Amino acid sequence: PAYRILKPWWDVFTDYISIVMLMIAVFGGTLQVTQDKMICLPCKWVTKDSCNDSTGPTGIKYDLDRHQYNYVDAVCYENRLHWFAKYFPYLVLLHTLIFLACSNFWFKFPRTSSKLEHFVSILLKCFDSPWTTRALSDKKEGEQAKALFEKVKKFRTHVEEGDIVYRLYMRQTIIKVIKFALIICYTVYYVHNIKFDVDCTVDIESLTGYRTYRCAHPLATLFKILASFYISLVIFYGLICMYTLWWMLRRSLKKYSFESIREESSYSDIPDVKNDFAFMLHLIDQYDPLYSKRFAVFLSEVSENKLRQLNLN
Amino acid sequence: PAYRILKPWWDVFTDYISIVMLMIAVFGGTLQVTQDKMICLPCKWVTKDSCNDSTGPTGIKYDLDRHQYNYVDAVCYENRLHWFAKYFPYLVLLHTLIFLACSNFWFKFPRTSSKLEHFVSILLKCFDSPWTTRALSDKKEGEQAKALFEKVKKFRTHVEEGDIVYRLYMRQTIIKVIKFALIICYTVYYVHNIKFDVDCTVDIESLTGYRTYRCAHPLATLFKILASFYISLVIFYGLICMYTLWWMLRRSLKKYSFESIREESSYSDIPDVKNDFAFMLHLIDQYDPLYSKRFAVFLSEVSENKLRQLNLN
Amino acid sequence: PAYRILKPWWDVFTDYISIVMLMIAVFGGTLQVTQDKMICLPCKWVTKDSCNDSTGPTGIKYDLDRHQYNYVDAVCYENRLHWFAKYFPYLVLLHTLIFLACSNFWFKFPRTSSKLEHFVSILLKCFDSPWTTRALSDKKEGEQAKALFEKVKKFRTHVEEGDIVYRLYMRQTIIKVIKFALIICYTVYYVHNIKFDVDCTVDIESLTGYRTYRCAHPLATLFKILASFYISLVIFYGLICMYTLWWMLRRSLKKYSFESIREESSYSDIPDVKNDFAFMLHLIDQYDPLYSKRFAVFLSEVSENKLRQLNLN
Amino acid sequence: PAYRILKPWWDVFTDYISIVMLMIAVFGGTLQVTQDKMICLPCKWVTKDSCNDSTGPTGIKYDLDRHQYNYVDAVCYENRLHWFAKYFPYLVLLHTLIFLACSNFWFKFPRTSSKLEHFVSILLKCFDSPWTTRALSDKKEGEQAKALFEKVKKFRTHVEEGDIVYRLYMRQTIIKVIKFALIICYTVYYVHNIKFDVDCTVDIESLTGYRTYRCAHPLATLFKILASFYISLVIFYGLICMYTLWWMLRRSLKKYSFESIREESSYSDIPDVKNDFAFMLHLIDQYDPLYSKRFAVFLSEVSENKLRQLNLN
Amino acid sequence: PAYRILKPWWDVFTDYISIVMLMIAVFGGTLQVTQDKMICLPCKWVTKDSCNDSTGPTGIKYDLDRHQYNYVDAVCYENRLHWFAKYFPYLVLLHTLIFLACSNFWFKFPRTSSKLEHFVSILLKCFDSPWTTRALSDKKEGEQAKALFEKVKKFRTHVEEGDIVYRLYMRQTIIKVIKFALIICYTVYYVHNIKFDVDCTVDIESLTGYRTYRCAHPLATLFKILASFYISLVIFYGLICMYTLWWMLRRSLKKYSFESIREESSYSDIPDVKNDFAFMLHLIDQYDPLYSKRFAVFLSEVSENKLRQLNLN
Amino acid sequence: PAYRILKPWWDVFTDYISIVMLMIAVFGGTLQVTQDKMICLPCKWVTKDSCNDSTGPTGIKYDLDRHQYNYVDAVCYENRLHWFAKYFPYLVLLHTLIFLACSNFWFKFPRTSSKLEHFVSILLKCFDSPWTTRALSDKKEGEQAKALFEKVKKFRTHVEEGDIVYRLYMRQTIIKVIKFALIICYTVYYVHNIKFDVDCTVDIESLTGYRTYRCAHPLATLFKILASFYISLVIFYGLICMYTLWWMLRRSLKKYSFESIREESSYSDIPDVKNDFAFMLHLIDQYDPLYSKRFAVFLSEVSENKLRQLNLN
Ligand SMILES: CCCC[C@@]1(C2CCCC2)Cc2cc(OCCCCCCC(=O)O)c(Cl)c(Cl)c2C1=O
């Protein structure tokens, strides 16, 4: 609704990566639903579960109808084919949905959603107050300005003691980094099991007659292309999340200093925000510094004295 | 619209879970419409209604053309296949639309829809009132505030007589819990009955010539995957519903305790709500306490007296 | 628009049942147009136009190619398969469309649509006027109050002589009831006729060589399930329609005795409504009584006297 | 826009019949594009270019491979199948598009579209004035009423010169009637021609060996059902068009005798509208007469007299 | 949004024709990508690379398997089918997109889009200004009308030097006429080259054994139908384009002879617009002359003198 | 939003070329997913692993059933076909997506984004002001204008010291030119490796019997058509990008030469903009010069002085 301003730049690359993951997931899924077949032929000469590889040339007769071929194709497709070759689109679709849910649960949780909406509402009211220009460069605007002043005071009293949003943003990025590490741990290890050629040895003699078969999975090359693209793209995602975790654990976003604003505004009476509002204003500062610049005048008591003097006279 | 206030955190997890149940339901349904076939071959040697399992190898002939393979496939699909393997996506689709209808019958019933929409209008009027900023710490505003006071007084007089919302939410959550209990009661009993290869015996010798057949159901592994995922999802849904039922049966939702804000807001004359209105105030408090903070000053005769003094002056 | 307040609860359950019906209708239609198959085999030994049921086992050779099988499938699909087994989704789609048209013809007809929209506009205007709170408990507001009194008197003179809305809303329900009766009286009679096993005898010897054929319709069980579900759902629809028709012939909706609100408010000089206005006022009372209760003031001559007195002083 | 005022009730039934016509057209079209096959077999014993119909039973061997069957199906489909069976959905698609274009050409033509939009703007402003209440039963309202009076006078002097709206409505309804005559002229004549059993004699002996063939067309019954449904829809559409053409040819909508409303409103100074505005006022009367009731007071010389004396005092 | 008033009547028929060209193009394209095959048979007796047409009837045996038939189908589809039968839908799709680009480049170009936006904004203020009625038949209204007077005066010298809009609207229509010319030269000369019977002699004897084949393209009739429909639609489009070209070369659109308003309105002093603004005046005159009628009072020095005297008094 | 003000004519042609690139990419992609088959036949007589090309004729018998035909089709399609014939739609889709991301990174990056909406906000507010006409031709307008002088002075003091927008808009165009160089370098080099006829000698003798095969790729002509169309589209894209890069490198884009307008606007005290704001002023002047025309009056010292004496007197 009104959360568009509260997203830093690392949550835009995250959004586009997470939507292209979903589109390649549904592409692989509709491919595997569409065909994902296997073509298998029996080997006449066998030497310990291996095809022995033994006027004009003529064809080789196997004495099999089409439906025995279908049966052995299904059986060799299930039993002697790796599980990663079959359900990889479903795995990446599930992981994409878990990434999306982990990204948007912070917004959709009502306990922090209320605080976010309240903060962005008073931020828009602070930005739209015309008295900032007179404070930084008569009466009725005095009453709307004092309405802003005491409701900003009420908000500062209301949200200072909390510790919830910073903890949520800790846990979200922590589980995102851990899940990225697990995905890279298993995917590159199991990606080599997809291959065009596969040999099944099922021991179903009473239905066909032969024992070992030579199969051919035709979608293996395209699935390897999709898997390699997915791995490289989730490396990019993991580096982005690692950088934002390092930034948020390095800048010590619990508390906010406010020296660089008072040094230019020459308002010597300004306090420092303690926690859970300092981090939120750090986030809007990483959006831009000007929105935090115009939030300065609604906290100085000398600005309050100037406002009440202009109201009285 | 503005009904997001009226939903706690346990009623958006329910919605998201219902969406993902509906997606897996429609995916299983379109798969079952798309193929859901099976491949059946006759066993040449039969022992106790089971297949006996008995220079170069050559294929086994059956002297059966393709169309009577199609016939025996259809017959052994319709007769000797367990019905849970066939209609599981339709079953879970039916269950998720029952869950959606139960979760939205609270809002779509007009006798409660009117009460909630008028309550939302009253609360947005109370929240948007500028006089609460003065109250928690000038004639037309006072008259508008007095109109607000009289309208919330008659609204309180109106909705205190009912008891419909609390009992509907009771009879909604309890049937959601019993639906969860029955779903888990039967689907884990029947989930073991889907499998890849199945032996069918349908007694058609006048048409094919053989008696018993060995079949293969190629979608069994993926349907078992989807069924296990659905069972785990139903478990998490049921734990959420049992938690909210325990909360509503423990907290004694009918009455309101309001002294906890009376003692700090210094308005020693506030009443205790009887039923069907204190429950909704508890629900808004479960969203956030601040909307209940701003509703404190609108029900106190000292506050109407202060407004009367201000209107006199 | 805002016509949701103009539909009772027995026209919302109808609106959901009659879209579930369309959903199962389009599902059955796409299934029937997608598969549309039945598999047929010839019986070599025949008795009374039924199949006689007569080293290792070997297949039975009919010496037919695939295209003869296709031809006999088409012939036994049309000539010896019952029409209810084929066009049932189109029948239920037609019934659902006629039900929806009968439900919304009342709204879409302009001669009553004008009365309904101008009615709901004056009720919304009477709801939103601020003088109602003062009257149930400063001259410009009296001017709009006098204008609204005049237009309410104009409405009362305008709509008191008609009967078209009541006549249409009774005729729609009675033809819905008779439609429900027709649907149940043929569908449960013809629902037993679909089955998996069908025998066809079509007299084509000059083309294939055989006389009678044993067939198989694989969609029979799913179509029977859909038909039974449709019958139960139409039964629920008909019960709702019977209830509302009994309500209309019970409560005698032509006139409205308006005693309770006048006794509660002590405005003893109020008249009763003749017809075609009491109907919509009964409907909005079935929505909620407060819209009618706050409509009481704009008809009372003592309320007119108080309005002109407040205009005078 | 808000053109629902400018549509009589017979243009809504038309606008829904044209939708269901489009629906059956697109359904028949997609079914025909999907299958529309026909299965052909050769007759071994032929007399006078017709199939003569001359221990256990055995099949009849033609010694033909599948791809020749496909060739003879294509040939007997393209030559000896009547064109009404093949192109009926495309014909009805073209027809319903011509109905939609003929319905909306009266709106999309700009020379009349400007008059309709400016007319409906004037009627909404005249309907939304509070001065007509006083006219039927303080200075700036008189001034804006005078401005609206001048606009009404300018509109009356402007549109009194034309005839184009009535001319176009003639030219639309008469060609709708002619198109009805043409459709019912040929379609009921040709509808018997589609049928299931179809014979062909295409003179291909050098490629197959046989001369005549017997064929089957498995969609013929469904196409006959769809054609009958389309015929009934055309009949209903044409009855509606005949009724509205007859009504508008007998009412003589060029001029309006305005006597019957001011004989009871007691505003005797009213003229009769000559052309192109009386027809539009009859159209909005067929919507409802109250809109022209509230437009009647804004044209009376005694009404400007009362307005300007109220401006004087 | 409100760009519709700039479009003449011939630019709307052009738009709807371009829509129906697009839908027939996409229908032909989806049909061609769906099937577009042909069925080919070899003929045993050959004369001049054609087939010579030289106890019961028996079929002809060719000893070709299905995959050889598929190969010869592919070869005779690619090498001996005319290119117009294959790429006609994509060709007409390209032509439709070119026509749409030629009709919307006049809007999407910024140097003319800004001028059109300024023209439509100034004409809507001139339509909504209330001083026009008083001129053709209070101090702040006259002052803002003076502001609009000077804005119109500066716009007049802002647009009196250009020619870009007229140049672009000339060039677009003349290249559309050129494109119609090219379309009519090639498509009627090439439309005769599709038919049901096509011969191929492709010289693949080492793989099959036969030399010449006779094929059957089963979509030639429907493609001929679509091509004839497209040809007639193109002819109608071109007649519209020739009409607007003749209108542009005949009516001398560069300057406007504006007197037809001034002898009617007795405003004896008015100038003649020279170029690039009189063209826009013609363009809005083709919509309706009312907008040019109301623009006269915002361009006459006697009208600024009257407003100046009125603001003085 | 209204951000079309920022895109010149070369930035709209680029977007339309990109979207038609995307539709031809997805068309080729869905076609390749849908069929992309290849039909292969063995060659009986072999010379250097190539086909030797050697009463009525009869077919050549290969003694191959359909399933090993499918196997050899898959093997020859995977091993002995160039990868550009198979992954061209995926490649061009990737290039289209990276072009779109490169084009929209200038908007989606927040550090420059915020500067863009702040700049466009002050530009629309300057265009919306009514005092520019008075400047280039009562007192609260003077106060509003003074406030907007303070706002534009704040904008000028803030955004002037940056360079990031100019740096990013250079870096985007340079990599678009680099991508053009790469695409034209490799695509036309590899475009000739798609062909109708392909020979595969894949050494599968113990499964089929033959050694060399002749194949036919039925999509090669359509893929070559699409490739040529894509190359021409890339060429147009690259000429547009090279032109705008040359304009950017040549026209000394960093600083504005504003003195050409102060002689006619008679405000000689206007300075030249240093950097990163003159880029935006060029980028709006490319749209239209009026927005820069009426931007002189809001920054000139004599303009604030004339407003000062207008407020004083
Ligand atoms: C085993 C002896 C058969 C003899 C036969 C003759 C043809 C020239 C030599 C003998 C007839 C026939 C029909 C077929 O269609 C069957 C339809 C299956 C396609 C479904 C999916 C798709 O559409 O792909 C197929 Cl596939 C073949 Cl192979 C053959 C032949 O070989």
**CA distance linking residue D116 with residue D6, whole number of Å:** 8
Looking at this protein, which amino acid is placed at residue B35? Answer: Q
Task: Measure the CA–CA gap between D113 and D110, rounded to whole angstroms.
Answer: 5
Put simply, whether F8 touches E (Cβ < 8 Å) is: yes
The token duo for E311 is: 């603001």
Rounded CA gap, A238 and A235, in Å? 5
Instruction: Give dist(CA C273, CA C170) in Å, integer.
Output: 19
- Shortest-distance Cα residue to atom 15 of ligand 1: D66
Whether A269 contacts A155, CB under 8 Å: no
Distance CA B226, CA B26 (A): 11
The beta-carbon neighbor of C218 closest among B44, B66, B74 is B74
B127 domain-assigned:
no
Distance E70 CA to ligand 1 centre (A): 12
Query: D66 in ligand 1 pocket by Cβ < 6 Å?
Result: yes
**Exposure pattern of A3-41 as b/e (b: 16+ CB <10 Å)?**
eeebbebeeeebeebbebbbebbebbbebbeeebebbbb
The two tokens of residue D279 are 């027809």
Phi, psi torsion values for C197, nearest 5 degrees: -95, 125
Q: H-type helices in chain E, by residue range?
A: 10-34, 66-79, 84-108, 110-128, 131-136, 139-159, 164-190, 220-250, 259-265, 278-287, 290-293, 301-312
Domain that holds residue D98: 10-49+64-312
Q: Which of D41, D66, D133 sits opposite C147 (nearest CB)?
A: D133
**E61 CA from centroid of ligand 1 (Å):** 15
Among A residues 117-136, those touching chain B with beta carbons less than 8 Å apart: 118
Query: Dihedrals φ, ψ of A300, to 5°?
Result: -90, 130
Q: Of D106, D134, D116, D137, nearest to D14 (Cα)?
A: D106
Spatial contact of C212 and C43, defined as CB atoms under 8 Å apart: yes
Residue C95 belongs to a domain: yes
CB A260 within 8 A of CB A290: no
Q: Which chains does E contact via 3+ CB–CB distances below 8 A?
A: D, F
The approach used to solve this structure was: cryo-EM
Strand partners, D30: none
Which residues on B lie below 8 Å from A68 (Cβ)?
Answer: 41, 59
- Please tell me what DSSP assigns to residue A204: -
C37 inside domain: yes
> Nearest CB to E59: which of D71, D109, D208?
D208
Subunits that touch chain B (at least 3 Cβ pairs < 8 angstroms)?
Answer: A, C
Number of domains, chain B: 1
Residue A5 lies in a domain: no
**Does any domain span residue C57?**
no
**Token reading at E203:** 């010289």
Question: How many CA within 13 A on the CB side of residue E197?
Answer: 7
Question: Could you tell me the strand order of the sheet in which C39-42 lies?
Answer: C39-42, C212-216, C199-201
The tokens of F196 are what?
């109708």
Distance separating alpha carbons of residues B70 and C39, to the nearest angstrom? 7
How far is CA B243 from its chain centroid?
14
Q: Rounded to the nearest 10 degrees, how much is the dihedral formed by the CA atoms of C39, C44, C49, C54?
A: -100
Q: Which residue's alpha carbon is at the smallest distance from atom 17 of ligand 1?
A: C66
Residues of chain A in contact with residue B200, where contact means CB-CB under 8 angstroms, are none
Answer whether E61 sits within 8 Å of D62, measured CB to CB.
Answer: no
Count of other CB atoms within 10 angstroms of residue E303: 21
How far is it, in rounded angstroms, from Cα E184 to Cα D296?
A: 57
| Residue of A214, A237, A213, A223 lying closest to A190 (CA atoms) | A223
Place of tokens 């029900």: B299
**Does A246 map to a domain?**
yes
- Which of E31, E52, E68, E87 is best to mutate for the F interface (most F CBs within 10 A)? E68
DSSP element (H, E) containing A40 = strand A39-42
Task: Give DSSP secondary structure letters for chain C.
Answer: --GGGGS-GGGTHHHHHHHHHHHHHHHHHHHHHH----EEEE-SSEETTEE--------------HHHHHHHHHHHHHSSS-THHHHHHHHHHHHHHHHHHHHHHHHH-HHHHHHHHHHHHHHHHHHH-THHHHHH---HHHHHHHHHHHHHHHHHHHHSS--HHHHHHHHHHHHHHHHHHHHHHHHHHHGGG--S--EEE---TTTTS-SEEEEE-TTHHHHHHHHHHHHHHHHHHHHHHHHHHHHHHHHTTTSB--HHHHHHHT------B-SSSHHHHHHHHHH-HHHHHTTSGGG-HHHHHHHHHHHH-
Q: Which residues contact A249 (CB under 8 A, 6 or more apart)?
A: none
Contact between D34 and C33 under an 8 Å Cβ cutoff? The reply is yes
Exposure string of E269-283, with b = 16+ CB inside 10 Å and e = fewer, is ebeebebbbbbbbbb
Q: Which residues in chain C have their CB less than 8 angstroms from residue B210's CB?
A: 57, 59
**D191 DSSP assignment:** G
CA–CA distance, C284 with C303 (Å, rounded to integer) = 23
The whole-angstrom distance between residue F51's C-alpha and the CA centroid of its chain comes to: 47
8 Å CB contact between A21 and A89:
no
Would the CB of F66 count as within 6 Å of ligand 1?
Answer: yes
Q: Which of A44, A67, A207 sits opposite B69 (nearest CB)?
A: A67
- Closest alpha carbon to E44 in E213, E259, E207: E213
Q: Is F143 helix (H, G, I), strand (E, B) or coil?
A: helix
In angstroms, this model's resolution equals 3.7
- Using alpha carbons only, give the angle D81, D87, D91 rounded to the nearest 5 degrees: 150
Write down the residue that tokens 């009661």 correspond to: B185
CB distance F196–E33 less than 8 Å? no
CA proximity to D91, closest of D21, D142, D161: D21
CB atoms within 10 A of CB F147: 14
| CB of F310 less than 8 A from some CB of E | no
Edge-first strand listing for the sheet containing E41-42: E41-42, E213-216, E197-200
Nearest CA residue ID for atom 6, ligand 1: D65
Restricting to D residues 142-171, those with a Cβ less than 8 Å away from any Cβ of E are 147, 150-151, 154, 158
Report which of D264, D190, D198, D195 is spatially closest to residue D230, judged by C-alpha positions: D190
From chain D, the residues in CB contact with C63 under 8 A are 58-59, 61
Those residues with Cβ within 8 angstroms of residue E221's Cβ, 6 or more apart along the chain or in another chain: D78, E196
Residue C58 lies in a domain: no
Q: Which of B14, B24, B12, B16 is nearest to B230 (CA)?
A: B24
Give the C-alpha distances (Å, rounded to integers) separating C301 from C125, C145, C293, D208.
20, 13, 16, 98
For residue E238, give both structure tokens.
Answer: 């071109």
Q: Is the CB of C53 less than 8 angstroms away from the CB of B206?
A: yes
Can you give the CATH number for the domain in which B251 is found? 1.20.1440.80
Residues of chain B with C-beta less than 8 angstroms from the C-beta of A81? none
- Among D61, D69, D136, whose Cβ lies nearest the Cβ of C63? D61
C48 touches chain D (CB under 8 A): no
| Identity at F274, one-letter amino acid code | K
Contact C222, C85 (CB under 8 A): no
Non-local (6+) Cβ contacts of E306 within 8 A are: E135
Q: Is residue A281 part of a domain?
A: yes
Q: Name every chain E residue with its beta carbon within 8 A of the beta carbon of F8.
A: 110
- The residue assigned the tokens 């004295």 is A305
Tokens of B113: 């829809």
Cα dihedral angle (F247, F251, F254, F255), rounded to 10 degrees? -150
A266 class by beta-carbon count within 10 Å (0-12 exposed, 13-18 middle, 19+ buried)? exposed
CB–CB of A214 and F208 under 8 A?
no
Are the C-beta atoms of D119 and D287 separated by less than 8 Å?
A: no
